[PDB]
Structure formats: C-alpha cells, structure tokens
Write a protein that binds this ligand. Structure first.
Ligand SMILES: Cc1ncc(C[n+]2csc(CCOP(=O)(O)OP(=O)(O)O)c2C)c(N)n1
Ligand SMILES: Cc1ncc(C[n+]2csc(CCOP(=O)(O)OP(=O)(O)O)c2C)c(N)n1
Ligand SMILES: [Mg+2]
Ligand SMILES: [Mg+2]
Lengths: 694, 694
C-alpha cells in the first residue's frame, strides 16, 4: 500500500554512504523548516533520492563555475520545494554552506522560500508561481537549439560543446496549470530532444489527496502531445529513475516526460502522504521520530557526517575535470570557427556590431500615414540581417503583429513546414500558436539560457493572458521583449473584448516593466534602437504599437525617446525665461492630438509645449535636472492625453491638471468614429488646456 | 480533394434545408463584405452544424430567450459571431435582416464578437479565446447544483431543470491553457450534460495549424476522462446527429466531438486558407460563391421566402416545447412549494428575512484576528441561511478560509477523499491549481442562473485569472473572487508571492470593485454588502490578509457599504472645525492610520482617519458625501497602503503624501517586512507632518 511504493531499489555502485547522503537530505530539510517555523519540508524529503541522482550523477556541471557555458541546466518548477535545490547546492560544493540552510526564509539570506535567480549561485531561474519554471524550461530548450544554430550548426548530434540537457522537476500543481499544457503542447511540436522533465505524481497538494480535483491520466495526455513518456514507481527506485533517464537521453526527437509516483514526506511516520507534510513545519516530535527511523541523533540539529560531505563534495573534482575536457573541445571549436567565436564573444560582452543601426529606417514628417506596428516590422526587417542573435515571433498573429523579419525562415523541424512558412532547425521565426502565457514564459527561458535576444508578439489586450510571466521577468530584471499591437480603441471593429482600456496603467504599475509607446514610425525605430542597445538597463520591455495608421510628426528625436519623455516642440513662443503657458503631455497615437491642439491654442494666443512621453518609466529614471527641463514645476497648467484610463497620469498633471482619457469599455465600430465619440479630438485637448488655466 | 466537403444528409432533409444552409453562407459572406472587415470563413463551414443545433438539436423558445428551461449555447470561438447571429435571425429570436446588415457598426445588435445583454439569446460575452468553453464548464456545473436546490429527487432526465450546454470551440480555444484546465476539471466532475464541438479545421490566423499544432487533441480528451468522438466533414449532418445522440446517451462523462472541416467552404479560392478566417472575401469571391450555390451574384442579403418560413417554424416548435415544459414545472411547483418559494426568492434577487442576524461581531481590543479568518467565520454563519451561496478554492481552502464550516463538497461521491466528502449537490468547490479556469467558471455559474458562487486564491494569482476577471467586469455580472494574502503581510513565501502592483492593476479594471476590509468587522460588513447587492451588480474582488490584524474602534456597516467613511475624528475638534490632516488607509494599513492619529494628537495635530475599503464605491457616491469625508479645503492628506502609489495620487493631490511600496518584497516574517519597508505609525505621522508643511 504505502509500503509497496516506498521500497528501495539501489543500483550496483550504491554504498551505505549514498544511503546516508540521502537520509541527510531528508533531515536537513526537516530541520531547516523546523528552525524558521514555516516552509516546505515534505517534497524535499521524498525527492531526495531523485535530486541526489541528478546533481551527483546525471548532470554535467561544475560546482566552481555556475556560469559554465556548457553546463546542463536544472529548473525546479515546483519552487516551494526550494530545499531540494538548496541542499544539492550545499552538498555538492556550489557555494551554499550549512549556515545558509540554517537561514532558510530569513531577511537577506541566500535561501529564500522560493529560489531566486541571482540571489543564489546555481539557481537558473526564479520559480514559485506554479507552471512558470516548466514553461520557461521549454524556452531554455528552444534557445539551446537556436544557440547551436549560431555557434556550431555543422557539428553532429551530441558532438558539440554546445550540446547539453534541460532537466525539470515539476509537481501536481505545475501539471494542473494551463501554462504547462501550452508549453508542453508546443515542446512536442518543436521536438525538443534535450528536455527531460520529472513529474512528481504524489497524489498530494494543499487540499490533501488530489483525487478531489485531479482524475486525469497525465501520462496519456503527454503521449497525446507527442512527448516521450515513461512511468516510474516509487521515490526510492533509483534504478527505475536511472533507466528512465538513459532511455530519455537516447530519444533525441521528442522531449521526455517521466512520471514518478511518490509518497510525500517519506519517512515521516504520521505526516507522510498528507497535505501537512507539504507546507508546514513537521513539529519537534515528527522530526525526532524521523531522525530515529534513519539512525540520526534526535537531540542534535543540522547534523552532517564528515564522510557524507566528503563524498558529495566529490562533485567539485568531477565537475572540474568534466570542465577541463569540455575546454579542449571548445578551444578546438574556436580554432575551427573563428567567426562564430567572435560572435559568441560579442554576445557575451553584450556588444553590438559596428553600424548595426546604420540601415535604420526613417520617414519624412508629412509622408503617408503609417501604423506604428508597420514601422516596427520595417525596423525589424532592417536590423535582422545585422543581428543574428535577434529572433522571435508571434502568438498566431504574425500578419497582425508585424513580427516576421522579411525574408526570414521559421524555427522548427522541417516536417512542420507549411505553405506559408518554411521551418528549419536553426530558423528565426517563432510560432507560438494561440498560447500567449507560454509565449511569455518561453521568452524568459530564452534570455536566461543565453545571450540571444527574443521577442514575442500579440495584441496588447492579451497581455492579460501572459501576466504572470511578465511579472516574473520584471522581478528577475531580465531583458525580455513583448510586442503588443492594437493598443487601443484605435483597433476598431473587433470591439470591447479586444480594445485595451486599463492595460497601460496596469502594465506600468509592475515595478521594473518599461512600457514603451512610440508616437509615430520614427519613435518606433528609435525605440527598438534603445531596446537593443540596452541604453536604459536590463529589465523587460513592452513595446506598444497601434493597429491603425498615424501621422509622421515633426520634432521626433532619438536621444529624446531614449530619455523616455522629451519636448517635441515648444510653442513659438518664445523667450528666454519664457515658460510655456500650458504643457500638453501625450503618448503613442494621441501625440498627434497634442500637436493639432497646440495649433488651435496658438491661434488663440495660448503658448503650448508638446511633450511626447514614449516611456514614463525611463523619464522618471532621468535626473530631476532633465525632468524639470521637460516639465518645469512652475508650470501647473498640464494636460495628459492617452487612449487608456487616467489612473497613471494624475501624479504628473497635479491638482490643477486635466486628463483626456477613456474610463469605460469600447464599442464595435471604425476607429475614427470611436476616437470622435470618446472625445479624442484636438478640440477636446485644446478645451482641456483652457480649463487647465482656470 | 475534397472528400471532406461531401454531403451526408439525413432522411428528413429536403431541398429547403439545403437552401437554408446555403443562405447562412452567403448571408455571412455579404454581411462581412458590407462593412468590409470581419470573420466570414468559419460561419460558412459551420453552417450545417449551427443549423442543426438551433433548428433541431436544441430545446429553446425563440420568443422567450430567458426561458428557465432552455438548452444553453456558447459560441466559444467568438470571432465567428455571424454563426450565432444568423441562427438568431433565421429562427425568430429577435434579430432581423437589418441587424445582419449592421454587422460591426456603432451601436448595432451585432458587434464583432457576441455581447451578453446586447443581443437576445447571447448567453455570454466571448472573443478572448478559451473563455466561452471554460465558462460553459461553469454553466454545466451550475445546472447540477441548481438541480440540487430545486428538484434533487427527480430522475435522470425527468426534471424540468434538466437541459444541455452546447459549445462550439475552435483551434485557438483548444490551444489556450484555460481550456485545458477547464476540460480537466470537467471530467473530474463528470458533467454529463455538456457537449462541445471542436471545429478542427487546420486553420488559424497564421494559415495551416501544422506550424504550431501537432497534438492529437481527441486523445488528450480521452486522457482527461471525456466521452470523445470524431466526425469527419463539415457537410456530414448524419455523422453530426449520431454524434449528438451518442453524447446525450452518455450521462457520466462530458462529451467532446472533433468535427474535421474545411474553413470557408465553398469559396473556390479562399477556402482552407487563413484569409477566409478574418477578412472580407472581396467582390469576386463573393460573386463566385453565390454562383456555386445558385444565388444571384448581383443582389445582396437575399433570403428566399420559403427558406425563412421554414426556419421560423422554430418559433412555433419553441412555443409548444415551452408549453409542454410548463405543465411539468407547474406539477413540480405543486409537488415542491418550499423549493419553488426559493426559486422565486432567487429570481427576484431577494434575501430571506434575518439572513444577516447571525452575522459575527468582534469587540475592539479583542485577540488580533486575520481578515481571512473573519471571512470564513462570516461565510460559516451565512451558509446555513443562504442555500444559493456556494464556492471554494484553487487548492487553497485551508489558506483562503473558503469552506463553510460543516459543509460538504461538490462532485461525484467517487472523488470523495479523507478530507472532503463529495455529493452531487455538494457545496464546496475544488478547482485544483487552476485559477484561470476558476475565474471563467464563476462567470458561467452566475450567467447560468441565480446562484451566488465565489472563488478563492492568493491575491498574487489574480494574475493567472485576469482575462476572466476582466470579461466579468465587461459583462457587469456579479462574480466574487476571494483574494487572500494580500501583501508583504504574507511573509516568508517571498517576492514571487507578495502582491505589490495588484491592487492598482485590479482597481484599473473598469467596473471591478476592489473591497479591502480594514478588520474582521469591516470584513463582515463587506460580505453583507456584497450579498445584499447594495452597490449594483458587477464583479467583486474581496481582499483579505494572511496575518492577524487589530479589531478597531469606529467600524460601521453603513460606512463600508459606502466604500470610504470617517473612522475617527481627532479629539480636539469643534463643529465646523476641519481636521488639520486627513489619513486615508485600507485593509491592514488602517491600524497605522489610527496609531499615527494618537502620535499626532500628542503633538497638537488633529487628524481624521478615513478607512477606504472600496475606492470604486466611494467614487460612485455623490460629491456631498465625498466632500463630507474628504473636504476639498483640507489639502493636507496621507494615503497608506501596502501596494504601489499609482492609484492614490488623484485622491491626495499635489501636496499630499503616500506611504506605499514601490518595489518587490523579500522572504522574511511580516513584522520585519512592514518595519523594513516603512509601514509604521511613525512613518505615517512623519508623512502627515510633511503634508502640512508643503
Ligand atoms: C499558480 C499558483 N497557484 C497557487 C500557488 C500556491 N501553491 C503553492 S504549492 C501548491 C500545490 C502543492 O501541490 P503540488 O504541486 O502537488 O506540490 P507538492 O506539495 O506535492 O510537492 C499551491 C496551490 C502557486 N504557487 N502558484
Ligand atoms: C486569447 C486570444 N488570443 C488571440 C485572439 C486573436 N484570435 C482570434 S481568432 C484566433 C485564431 C484563429 O484560429 P481559430 O481559433 O482556429 O479560428 P478559425 O479560423 O478555425 O474559425 C486568434 C489568435 C483572441 N481572440 N483571443
Ligand atoms: Mg503533489
Ligand atoms: Mg481553426
């Protein structure tokens, strides 16, 4: 029953020491949680044998260089079981020490409740929101193939220094989350041979026994996708685990899924196989009882036998040696491929090739009205050729997002090629399907895996579908790029389910997400330029683009875009010491109203400054000297214009300012009717400027 | 090719029916050609199916679209709105030919995507892919639970409350994560009366689906536990109708029917392409199509009299079905006077006498109590008195306090577990780790009938369910989202879990009321107001703390119901004496407001404390009330909230202060976090002082 599943099956090399190492994992987890009084001990206990096998034996990595280019990557998607990762990091010499384990979940420690990228050496990604790690792992896998395309394409299956695996530990919760279905469905399409996922199937979650909400045959589901699926029984069946792993490595045309049936919190006599093992301290009695069962001293805590540590720390030496062997192959590769090596070096130093931005498109103020999205495609098409690290695509909307670099092929197995798209393994164009959330997660995987630069595209509205991934990117401060088109009622007839209203405010609220909304075709070009150049740091970016055509304007300025907000034209106006009478601040498709109203106000002896604000976050990060030059605090008469809610503009316009906004849902009609009906006209901007003064 | 587009007409089918079908196709083609944008393709290929469902399959009355006993239909592929419109028209539901001629124009009854309440017989707003299907699930669940309340002892199929939910889904719906989650939980709950067609048609916006979709969708459905069947060809009405009766025969598994189809049949050049999906065919293709079907290529919106006469028979059929049904209902009413009284109470949106008589109270100064604990206490107290109130949690019942004490669980008894006994007419919902599906399901429930469902998860994960939440607000229906662990207050789980931008981001959604009780009593008053429907009929997100908070002096039911009210008046005041300063706070930060009020009096500063549990309710109150609470002559204002500042600027104005958190948190206990991030009475007091000196 409970006894059948928790029976050991140790391989031939496995000594008493290995059994002690495992037992050490289990008690360290129980003690670590007991110390702080809250945490997640149960899963760490049952997964000890698996985690042990992965770090000590399965994976290629070097504990003295967690940045080693050629390392296998591990992702703990079940982020609650952070101790699983922390203890291997400690046991194997990765940088964590016993005192870090003893600091679980305390202010500023290297071991927070969920693992954080950059806080701890050896953590490949922040996880915790369930689904995210698995879905991102898919991205990592995809990136490794694309990175292979760029550095060593002609190498043979397995023979490249750039060949490695992505290992993922997922739980029931990961398996239930929609994002995982999406990412898995697409992983199969892309035949990601080097992705190997363990699913800890343990019939437990926070509401205890999973039967109350989970009846599916997950393994069959994965077979349905086109994954390589295996079922292994029992947490202690290291033999079963190791055979599954080798079977998976041998399959190179399908990502692998190994469902491992387990009893949570083994061997806690009373608490195992319960929800309580998942998310609370076991209590002193259950901890003592566990120590007795494994032959540990129930009166001491954080006990680590010298022989155990001496053994596990052998990974340091094994790692070093693997790294030294790998180095010869790499060095050989560098001599054989000086060109591609120079690229690798350019990408790792985060530099761009000379004159990469020389073909940058330009449009003349007054020329034909051009949609900011069409401008983006043109800019992408121009920079493509000059930036091999740039790839990306769309969530089934390539036509509408303008994300296909002109004359680029598609990323995928040739057997997925269609009439419209030719797929090569080292292709450039990404097709995510109608999978925005997985798209988001994938993009974080891509830039976490390596130095490539990927972007993903969909309608602004569906930033709602991918929100948890965007948030996580910002938390991680990594440089993903989300192309969001059809940014307002401007989109017209598709109606209120599609038209964004709250979206810019809600996105601007996310600490560290830069929301970039170019006023016209040239601001667009200057935007990409600033994004790729990394002028404003290394956080995520949402690039907001219109469906409908907008004027090409006078007064646009690269340097000004890169500053976030700048003066598009003062009113003439003007004299030294000549503040303007009123400041109009606008963004994206509403800057043209600011301008036209500046004309209507001069014709009435009112002198208006127009400020284009393509990125409020970049503006706010500029020093006060610059900000007060653009928005002098002595001018209180201010008007903001944006086809979105007022919420995020109040601090900027102050007590006596006005905001021309949309506070309600839209309607199914053409854009011109919509902007008119909702009062997005030069006259309304003018009239607000006038009230701004009284 | 094609044998796919080959007809298979049953034995009753006449020439007329073939004309009826053909009319659907051209009506669709013209209807899009007129306005010059839209989605014609699918509406053409789905014609036979749509025709069969409304004309024949469904039990409904086209002159009472509110008929209690009607089969419900959901077109989850919202873009093919014409498929629903044309059947509404053809079958006498209220739409006329002029409505069809008004597709996608300002204020017409036929917007781009169907809109609940805008058109008679649209059951739900759809358009964001996945939403309709996921909610259909919720509808199915509602019907079961509604049967429990009205006619439980009736026999399988013998109830007037027994009917079906039909759902048309497309490739995009099938790809979307929310669909997976919903489907998976649909099988768990064994929703015998839910029957879904999936238009498997190898086409989406990026042309041929092979570029991003290789899975065997039908297998995947078998894996869940679903009664699956495959039918081949858009024209195979016989296949379709047998599939239909097979599905109705199976009463313990939700049924799924993959229909394989050629998009935009019979458009000679545009069928089977992405261009048939989402643009106007053009004049030639339209012409060509009429020729192929024997229609005048020079006349538009042509509807033969014998066609319409035939299709309109549905009015007559619908009438008699409604009449036969009435006898059973009336029989049922005589047989069940008590349950009829409930149905009547519920339809009139009434609450039983003394329903809020047991409402919990707590004395100011008593043991610190967490606002989530207060919620469960309240829920427990009202459960017995309100049969229509059900719901549960996204695998966090223990942590959300959503189980009504002494309640049973909703599901087949065979999913029962040690912790939860499931009955068919059980009350406690177990969504598992599927927040998005949870959101869509709550919308299904309250759309389907007059029951009142709530759903629970951590505030953080409103991110996972955002597109469902937003769609609820767009429809203005009275869903309820219990969001617990509202801030850094949640402690050691860390920055992936701690909400920062969420209150602001959620407040930004037009029509979502974000209710954050200050203490256990406010919590009780909040529920009272939500269930009373005092503030209208839209969605509510109820924000609750993980950690204990003081029971405060000056809480007031009437004030909560108003959204924002005066909690205390500084001690020094005279009549017509404004306070020196106003402290406005919410939820767990009100205690700081108070405690800084004491520190400010001890310094001869007279401060008003305003609790603002719901800013949207406060904003909806007349200015007389608002100015009574927040007199415009007092500029010296301070807001306090453990979230971002964004939503608070308009309220505190130019010279006010905001005590906010502008960055991500940290993994430590809650007291350390509030201290480190400046959430103390002193910091509130110091900010009051600066405001005065501005
Ligand atoms: C999207 C999301 N929803 C909810 C949570 C809260 N949560 C953390 S772990 C968990 C379920 C635990 O079950 P399982 O995934 O089986 O992990 P186990 O305890 O077996 O290792 C939940 C609901 C979360 N982190 N992310
Ligand atoms: C969540 C979401 N993402 C994207 C869209 C935009 N969109 C509308 S339909 C569609 C895909 C069209 O293909 P499919 O659903 O298979 O419809 P078909 O052409 O077969 O009728 C997309 C991406 C949407 N409406 N909702
Ligand atoms: Mg589990
Ligand atoms: Mg399709």
């Amino acid at each position: 029953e409970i006894s059948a599943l928790t029976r050991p099956r140790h391989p031939d090399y496995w000594t008493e020491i290995d059994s002690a190492a495992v037992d050490t994992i289990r008690v360290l987890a129980a003690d670590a949680v007991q110390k702080v009084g809250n945490g997640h001990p149960g899963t760490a206990m049952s997964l000890a044998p698996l985690a042990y096998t992965l770090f000590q034996r399965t994976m290629r990595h070097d504990p003295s260089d967690t940045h080693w280019l050629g390392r296998d990557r591990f992702v703990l998607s079940a982020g609650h079981s952070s101790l699983t990762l922390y203890i291997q990091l400690y046991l194997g010499g990765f940088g964590l020490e016993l005192s870090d384990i003893e600091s679980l979940r305390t202010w500023g420690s290297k071991t927070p409740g969920h693992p954080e990228f950059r806080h701890t050496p050896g953590v490949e990604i922040t996880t915790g929101p369930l689904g995210q790690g698995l879905a991102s792992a898919v991205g990592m896998a995809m990136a490794s193939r694309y990175e292979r395309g760029l550095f060593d394409p002609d190498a043979e299956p397995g023979a490249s220094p750039f060949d490695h695996y992505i290992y993922v530990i997922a739980s029931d919760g990961d398996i239930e989350e929609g994002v995982t279905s999406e990412a898995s469905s697409l992983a199969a399409v892309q035949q990601l041979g080097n992705l190997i996922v363990f699913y800890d199937r343990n019939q437990i979650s926070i509401e205890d026994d999973t039967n109350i909400a989970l009846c599916e045959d997950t393994a069959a589901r994965y077979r349905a996708y086109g994954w390589h699926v295996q079922e292994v029984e029992g947490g202690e069946n290291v033999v079963g685990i190791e055979e599954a792993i080798a079977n998976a490595q041998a399959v190179t045309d399908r990502p692998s899924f190994i469902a491992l049936r387990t009893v949570i919190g083994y061997p806690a006599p009373n608490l195992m196989d319960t929800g309580k093992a998942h998310g609370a301290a076991l209590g002193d009695d259950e901890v003592a009882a566990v120590k007795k069962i494994v032959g540990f001293d129930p009166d001491k805590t954080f006990q680590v036998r010298e022989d155990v540590l001496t053994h596990t720390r052998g990974l340091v030496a094994r790692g070093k040696q693997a790294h030294e062997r790998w180095q010869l192959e790499f060095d050989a590769w560098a001599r054989r491929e000086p060109e591609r090596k120079a690229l690798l070096d350019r990408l790792l130093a985060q530099k761009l090739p000379d004159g990469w931005d020389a073909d940058l498109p330009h449009w003349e103020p007054g020329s034909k009205a051009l949609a900011t999205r069409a401008a983006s495609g043109a800019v992408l098409s121009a920079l493509g050729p000059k930036l091999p690290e740039l790839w990306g695509g769309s969530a089934d909307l390539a036509g509408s997002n303008n994300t296909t670099i002109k004359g680029a092929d598609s990323f995928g197995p040739p057997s997925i090629s269609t009439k419209e798209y030719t797929a090569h393994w080292y292709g450039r164009t990404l097709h995510f399907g109608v999978r925005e959330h997985a798209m988001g997660a994938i993009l974080s995987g891509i830039v976490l895996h390596g130095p490539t630069r990927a972007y993903g595209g969909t309608f602004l509205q569906f930033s709602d579908y991918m929100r948890p991934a965007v948030r996580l990117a910002a938390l991680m401060d990594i440089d993903t790029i989300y192309v969001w088109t059809h940014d307002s009622i401007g989109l017209g007839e598709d109606g209120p389910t599609h038209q964004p209203i709250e979206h810019l405010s809600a996105l601007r609220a996310i600490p560290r997400l830069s929301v970039v909304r170019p006023a016209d075709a040239n601001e667009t070009a200057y935007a990409w330029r600033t994004i790729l150049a990394r002028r404003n740091g290394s956080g995520p970016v949402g690039l907001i683009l219109t469906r409908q055509g907008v004027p090409v304007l006078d007064g646009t300025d690269a340097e000004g875009v890169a500053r976030g907000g700048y003066v598009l034209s003062d009113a003439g106006g003007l004299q030294p010491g000549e503040e303007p009478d009123v400041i109009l601040i606008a963004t994206g498709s509403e800057v043209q109203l600011a301008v036209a109203a500046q004309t209507l106000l001069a014709d009435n002896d009112i002198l208006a400054r127009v400020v284009s604000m393509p990125c409020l976050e970049w503006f706010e990060a500029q020093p006060y000297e610059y900000r007060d030059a653009v928005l002098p605090p002595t001018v209180s008469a201010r008007v903001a214009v944006e086809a979105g809610v007022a919420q995020c503009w109040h601090q900027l316009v102050g007590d006596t300012g006005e905001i021309v906004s949309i506070e309600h849902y839209g309607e199914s009609a053409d854009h011109k009717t919509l902007f008119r009906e909702y009062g997005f006209t030069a006259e309304a901007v003018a009239a607000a400027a006038e009230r701004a003064l009284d």
